[PDB]
Amino acid sequence: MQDAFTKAIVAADLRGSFLSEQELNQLTNLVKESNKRLDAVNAITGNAAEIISDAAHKLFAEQTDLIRPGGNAYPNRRMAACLRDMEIILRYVSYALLAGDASVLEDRCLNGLKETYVALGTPTRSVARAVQLMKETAIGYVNSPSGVTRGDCSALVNEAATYFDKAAASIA
Amino acid sequence: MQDAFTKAIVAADLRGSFLSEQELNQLTNLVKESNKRLDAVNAITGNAAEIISDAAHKLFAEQTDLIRPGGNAYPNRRMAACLRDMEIILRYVSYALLAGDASVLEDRCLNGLKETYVALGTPTRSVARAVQLMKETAIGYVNSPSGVTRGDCSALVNEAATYFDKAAASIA
Amino acid sequence: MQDAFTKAIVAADLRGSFLSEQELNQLTNLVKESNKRLDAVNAITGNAAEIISDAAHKLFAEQTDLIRPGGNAYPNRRMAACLRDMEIILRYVSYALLAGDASVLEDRCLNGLKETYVALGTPTRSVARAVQLMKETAIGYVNSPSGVTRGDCSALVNEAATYFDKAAASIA
Amino acid sequence: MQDAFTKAIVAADLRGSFLSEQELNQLTNLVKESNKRLDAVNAITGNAAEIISDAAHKLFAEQTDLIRPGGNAYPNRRMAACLRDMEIILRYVSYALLAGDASVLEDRCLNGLKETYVALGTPTRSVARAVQLMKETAIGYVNSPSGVTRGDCSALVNEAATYFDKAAASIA
Amino acid sequence: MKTVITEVIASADSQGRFLNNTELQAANGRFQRATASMEAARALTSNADSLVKGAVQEVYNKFPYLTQPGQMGYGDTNQAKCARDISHYLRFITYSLVAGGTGPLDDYIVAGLREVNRTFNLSPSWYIEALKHIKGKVGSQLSGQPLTEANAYIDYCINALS
Amino acid sequence: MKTVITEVIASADSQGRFLNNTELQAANGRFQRATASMEAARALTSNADSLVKGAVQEVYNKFPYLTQPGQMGYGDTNQAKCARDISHYLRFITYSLVAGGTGPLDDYIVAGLREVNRTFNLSPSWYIEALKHIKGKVGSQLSGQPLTEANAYIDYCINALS
Amino acid sequence: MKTVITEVIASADSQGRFLNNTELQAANGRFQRATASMEAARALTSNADSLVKGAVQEVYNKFPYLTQPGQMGYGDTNQAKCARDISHYLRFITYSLVAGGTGPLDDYIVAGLREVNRTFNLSPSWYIEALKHIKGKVGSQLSGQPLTEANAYIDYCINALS
Amino acid sequence: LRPAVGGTAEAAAQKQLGITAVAPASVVELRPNASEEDLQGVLRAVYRQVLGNTYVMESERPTQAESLLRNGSISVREFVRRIAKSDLYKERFFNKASNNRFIELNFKHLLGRAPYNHGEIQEHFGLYHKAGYDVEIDSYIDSDEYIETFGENIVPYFRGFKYQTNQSAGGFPRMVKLWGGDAGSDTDRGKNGQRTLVTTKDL
Ligand SMILES: *[C@H](C)[C@H]1/C(=C/c2[nH]c(/C=C3N=C(/C=C4\NC(=O)C(CC)=C4C)C(C)=C\3CCC(=O)O)c(CCC(=O)O)c2C)NC(=O)[C@@H]1C
């Protein structure tokens, strides 16, 4: 697997060089902000069930068709599969946020997802809407954790946003 | 798997409606003719070895090439495989006749059969000819069962014919 | 798998005939030269580690790129896999030389190799260079064995050459 | 697996000694009689189906109870398993006769056989009688091969006899 | 196809090892036997027409009913199929002699034999009677190690039918 | 590459579970050690040319014969390859320090090491002697937790060679 | 162990078959080779004391450092262990000649060789130098097919060490 | 007497497909009182089948597990389950791949066949999400298919390329997409990485 540190090493190795001072500086900054990062990962994990639930409620209010007969969420079996998928995507985004790299999201979750959905007849645009709904909920938790030291988390929120956005773009 | 009853339910489910009285009536007619259907399935099973043998004799008389050296039914290993295949196809036709629906034949036997044969280099048209020869033998047994109450079985015979015909068309 | 004798009978079978006196004579000639063939196979087996080592040294001297960072033989993991491949090819050439037929090499060793290499990004022309270097070393051992009775081994050397050449042609 | 040569080596190894001239002499004698040994192994293999059949006929005449209902050979399934067992024992005795050592017979066939038979409820003494009947048939074939050069085979016959006897004693 | 040479190669490949003296010694045994095996093969090939005729007739003498009408022996097509089948047997025996293994016989005859014979209602006993006739005539034609080689491949077939 | 962070994520993924406090505690341990690990990595990088040259000379002192003609140490290409190899070792040690795992060393050096060394007849003892030289010099350069980190990655290599 | 006889039996057993002519031909190859193999084995046994003494001295000549103090060649215990090891190699070579396979060499020497040599810091090159010395002296003692047999088993060891 | 015009030899199809070594795959059984030579054969077979002809360096060999197999403390079946749960397996076949690709890899490695329908995918994806990786791997090893074919002493071998009793017709073409050749492998170490050979569209 890859993480931010591992990615830098791999690059330096291809050059056949010791890590450069500039590269070191970037890594040191990641270590310096690691506490904030850990808090953000905690916020998603601690609210994971609520994030998925809140998203699901909003999705099915927006798109009544999925839950009607003939919809892709329509028997209980399919509804269960839809909820399963949302949880899996959230898991991988949270993993990526700890790693600082989107590879884990790409390598397991994202690879072949759109193809699978098209074969099944799952509507990819709706799946993407679900990922956006999860994003709004999740980012809110990260942005307002309780009893955490007041501080600017904007860079971490932006990074989280990109991971959600990657997932959405792949799926759709 | 699918059967005639199961197929009707699936259709009504997509409409999200209770089965209609007309649809119910069709199902009742299938139940009314079920004894004849059972007798037909019995005729194939009871004469299965004879059906295959009689087909095989006719096939090898028609196509001497298969049994000559270099032929696809030469030598014993290949001949054995050919006879096995005929028995498998007959089995699935009999399954479909009990079900009243061709899906079991299509999903498990027919899908990818042509591809298999092409990869192997087996001549598909000869395979199809074998299925037609089996059909003539089988239909004879269905048409003249021993000790059965005299009646018109023609609709059931036609249904059997279609299943054989589907198999032949897929393979060729 | 196949050997020279097995190949001849399979051909005769397709003609549907008893082996011809001419075919018999060719086989008898193979039996007459069998001692020399056994000596040749011995030479490769006895010097197998030397053949691979000598080739490896020459390859890496010719192509510095492979051993540099970014090369396909860097790092140790890749170098190990490269040496494994050289040993496999030599093993199968020796098998083919005992059989008197190239099928063993073609059916097992050569089958899928080019596709594997393309996926990996291994440079096929370098692999081919490696096989040529092995060939020169191996042939030298066959041509100059200790304690073997002097005679003409030219036909066996030429046959060995072809097996190496087949491997090289397949790879690139 | 073990053979007569391998057995002698293992003994000498425990002494940590080069094989003694006496040990060498014994081995040389085995090589000297090897053609006769090969003839004997051929006689059993060539008549294997007859050996089992002739034994089976004698066994079931001797013990009518086995074939009656409630007997251990009494449904077809059991009778088939009985004939399978006789074939396995003969196979392993023939292996042992080529090896010149009973190890293969003991290690693969005989170990646990009596325990298995007792659990099954198979009568061990009848199994032993079957092995003795096979022995008499087999020895006859070895003693009277067709087109073999006339010579004394007595030592080989006695060796075969011991392997049969070992099998019988283990089973019982 | 099982031959001495393919079998040693297969063993080496399973262990992932180069052929060693163990394998080469076995190989030498195949090449030494080849002279006897070739002599057998040539004799069977020379008398193959006559061997088949006598074999087919022997079956009819052993099982007289077959020749009578409504029976498998009756009719030209049936008798022609008999001669074809016995010829196949002889052909694969000579192939096995030359190949230095039972592999030709195993792939062409033995595999699938039981299922085919059941479906076409061909008795193993007819073939066994023909093979035994051949074995007697071959015994007149060949002697010593050629004879031993011939007998082994005929006996292999007889056991497979049995 | 194995790092603390990749290992915790991998475990969670295998269970199919969101990361829990158990994983996050482990992650915190990696990020705290990072300051000492970075200090080590910077020092090894700064002295890398001198470390390598001394390391190579130590091998030549410990095994004088290598430098003599007909021996692996003799000749410019051979000597150059030595310096290249020791430099690789230092590079992968500093990578491991920064990564927070032995994974960089494991994937680049340790896998295949034994097979490569056998084929090229490179003695593990030469490398081990060089690494031990480095360890002594590093000990002068670093102290406390930086030193502990450095010593652990050098020791990992030494044990893998051993 | 691996011998021609055990290998043919193993193959037959795997397929669940009686031994056929294919196997027996292979077996005959082993029994014919036996005369040459026995002659080799007797000659190696007769000169085994001298072969080992010369082999050990050759190692000391090829690597003069070993004899110097603080080195593996130095001291009676070390020198005695050398002579023991080379003697073992000869013993297992003669066993392999008599067995008709490399199996004795494989089970006694080759299995576990690499791990043992690593732990005890025993160089494969010392053994290889001794074996090559023996191979030269054997060449003087034996000729023709005996010599061929001897050379193959010595070469097997050399390749396993390599 | 005259030959068939087309006139292929028996084995021609196998030759043409390159399945000639696996169509009737050799079966390796660990036997009681097995020699050291015999045990090594079994281990080779296991690594080839279970790890998809990917190379295993000497550092990666399990060693302690093999200690048990040599002892008889575990069977071949248990050994296979340890390898499949190991990080050797997980790294190659699981961490880089998607579930869809992982499931079909497991069928090929452990059962020796292709997935017969999208229901097999649905079942095994469902198990993983409820019970994680180890329960999943257990399913294949603890399945009637496994137990009847291989049982306890037989190393898994390739069953596809021959007709199996409950096989669907799609089963043989799917095995052809999974088999790269003798020199093929299922390797993570490629340009494209681990991708799905057998799509949902196929199933
Ligand atoms: C929910 C927002 C939407 C939805 C989802 C949905 N998904 C399926 C079926 C599958 N989803 C997957 C997904 C994955 N495979 C992977 O490997 C990963 C990452 C590890 C994921 C996330 C798979 C494999 C399937 C197919 C197998 C299975 O069904 O178990 C369905 C069911 C569709 C069907 O007809 O089977 C559904 C409903 N569908 C919607 O309508 C939502 C908008």
Ligand SMILES: *[C@H](C)[C@H]1/C(=C/c2[nH]c(/C=C3N=C(/C=C4\NC(=O)C(CC)=C4C)C(C)=C\3CCC(=O)O)c(CCC(=O)O)c2C)NC(=O)[C@@H]1C
């Ligand atoms: C951003 C997401 C919000 C935020 C975060 C924030 N956190 C800190 C400080 C700390 N965070 C932790 C938390 C952890 N460390 C761990 O080891 C674990 C997992 C086991 C956790 C959950 C710690 C240790 C600290 C330091 C101690 C402290 O209480 O300060 C800060 C302060 C800056 C820093 O990096 O030290 C901030 C800003 N705060 C916000 O306002 C965001 C909405």
Ligand SMILES: *[C@H](C)[C@H]1/C(=C/c2[nH]c(/C=C3N=C(/C=C4\NC(=O)C(CC)=C4C)C(C)=C\3CCC(=O)O)c(CCC(=O)O)c2C)NC(=O)[C@@H]1C
């Ligand atoms: C007989 C009428 C014809 C014939 C048949 C033949 N088939 C094979 C080989 C195979 N047949 C199958 C087919 C099936 N697999 C399935 O899943 C199904 C139904 C679901 C079928 C019917 C398969 C998979 C094989 C390959 C595996 C095997 O060989 O066992 C052969 C042998 C080809 C070869 O060279 O091996 C033959 C001869 N051939 C004829 O000549 C007839 C027209």
Ligand SMILES: *[C@H](C)[C@H]1/C(=C/c2[nH]c(/C=C3N=C(/C=C4\NC(=O)C(CC)=C4C)C(C)=C\3CCC(=O)O)c(CCC(=O)O)c2C)NC(=O)[C@@H]1C
């Ligand atoms: C049509 C293929 C030929 C035919 C069939 C036929 N059958 C009946 C009547 C009955 N068939 C059965 C037989 C079964 N019932 C079962 O439960 C089973 C399986 C366990 C079988 C095989 C029964 C019970 C009946 C009714 C009692 C009776 O013997 O009449 C008929 C009469 C009409 C009807 O089915 O009600 C007919 C026509 N007869 C032909 O003439 C066709 C050639």
Ligand SMILES: *[C@H](C)[C@H]1/C(=C/c2[nH]c(/C=C3N=C(/C=C4\NC(=O)C(CC)=C4C)C(C)=C\3CCC(=O)O)c(CCC(=O)O)c2C)NC(=O)[C@@H]1C
């Ligand atoms: C050495 C001359 C060149 C080289 C080789 C190299 N090979 C691989 C990887 C593989 N090699 C094979 C090949 C085979 N496997 C077999 O069983 C057979 C015989 C049937 C062959 C020939 C395989 C399957 C692999 C791929 C899967 C695996 O992991 O082993 C590599 C590794 C590439 C990587 O990126 O890790 C290399 C380097 N490369 C060179 O540059 C040399 C010229």
Ligand SMILES: *[C@H](C)[C@H]1/C(=C/c2[nH]c(/C=C3N=C(/C=C4\NC(=O)C(CC)=C4C)C(C)=C\3CCC(=O)O)c(CCC(=O)O)c2C)NC(=O)[C@@H]1C
């Ligand atoms: C050609 C590669 C080189 C060469 C070969 C050569 N060999 C012989 C003679 C013999 N070769 C053997 C060797 C074996 N017999 C076996 O059983 C085995 C496997 C265990 C081997 C390795 C034998 C028995 C002989 C015959 C007796 C003898 O030692 O002479 C010759 C002589 C001609 C012949 O075929 O008899 C030759 C030419 N010789 C060279 O000069 C080539 C470089």
Ligand SMILES: *[C@H](C)[C@H]1/C(=C/c2[nH]c(/C=C3N=C(/C=C4\NC(=O)C(CC)=C4C)C(C)=C\3CCC(=O)O)c(CCC(=O)O)c2C)NC(=O)[C@@H]1C
């Ligand atoms: C025949 C002479 C007598 C006889 C035999 C008989 N055996 C069984 C069942 C088994 N026999 C064995 C034995 C072996 N399996 C092996 O692998 C080997 C070599 C190690 C042998 C010899 C085994 C294991 C079984 C049980 C499993 C199986 O059947 O495959 C039966 C059947 C008993 C039952 O109720 O299942 C019989 C009848 N019995 C007689 O009466 C004869 C005197």
Ligand SMILES: *[C@H](C)[C@H]1/C(=C/c2[nH]c(/C=C3N=C(/C=C4\NC(=O)C(CC)=C4C)C(C)=C\3CCC(=O)O)c(CCC(=O)O)c2C)NC(=O)[C@@H]1C
């Ligand atoms: C004892 C069972 C009977 C007997 C044996 C006997 N055999 C021979 C001679 C030979 N036997 C063989 C046979 C083989 N060699 C092989 O390579 C194979 C397998 C492929 C076989 C089956 C051979 C080659 C010979 C030697 C040549 C010959 O024909 O003589 C003898 C003769 C002397 C000897 O000890 O070799 C004898 C005595 N004789 C009997 O009367 C017993 C009933």
Ligand SMILES: *[C@H](C)[C@H]1/C(=C/c2[nH]c(/C=C3N=C(/C=C4\NC(=O)C(CC)=C4C)C(C)=C\3CCC(=O)O)c(CCC(=O)O)c2C)NC(=O)[C@@H]1C
């Ligand atoms: C002669 C002893 C008797 C006889 C023969 C007879 N044979 C058949 C049919 C078949 N025989 C074979 C045999 C082979 N085909 C092969 O490919 C091989 C291996 C190379 C063999 C040995 C086969 C497969 C058939 C069936 C297909 C075919 O017709 O060719 C028949 C016809 C049986 C039927 O009912 O169709 C007959 C009559 N006839 C005699 O006179 C003897 C009693």
Ligand SMILES: *[C@H](C)[C@H]1/C(=C/c2[nH]c(/C=C3N=C(/C=C4\NC(=O)C(CC)=C4C)C(C)=C\3CCC(=O)O)c(CCC(=O)O)c2C)NC(=O)[C@@H]1C
């Ligand atoms: C230094 C202690 C001694 C020495 C070393 C030396 N090395 C080689 C050759 C090789 N060294 C390596 C090592 C690596 N390759 C890698 O990819 C890695 C991991 C990143 C390492 C550490 C390799 C693979 C080779 C062989 C192939 C090549 O040439 O690159 C040699 C030359 C040996 C030869 O003949 O090929 C030498 C001499 N040099 C000295 O003088 C010291 C004794």
Ligand SMILES: *[C@H](C)[C@H]1/C(=C/c2[nH]c(/C=C3N=C(/C=C4\NC(=O)C(CC)=C4C)C(C)=C\3CCC(=O)O)c(CCC(=O)O)c2C)NC(=O)[C@@H]1C
């Ligand atoms: C001779 C070339 C050099 C030498 C050798 C030497 N060997 C050892 C120690 C061992 N030798 C072996 C080898 C074997 N043991 C076996 O069981 C077999 C196969 C049957 C062999 C060939 C083993 C295992 C050991 C280690 C355990 C032991 O002491 O018995 C040493 C001592 C190693 C140490 O440092 O402890 C030596 C020195 N001696 C010389 O003079 C040459 C340089």
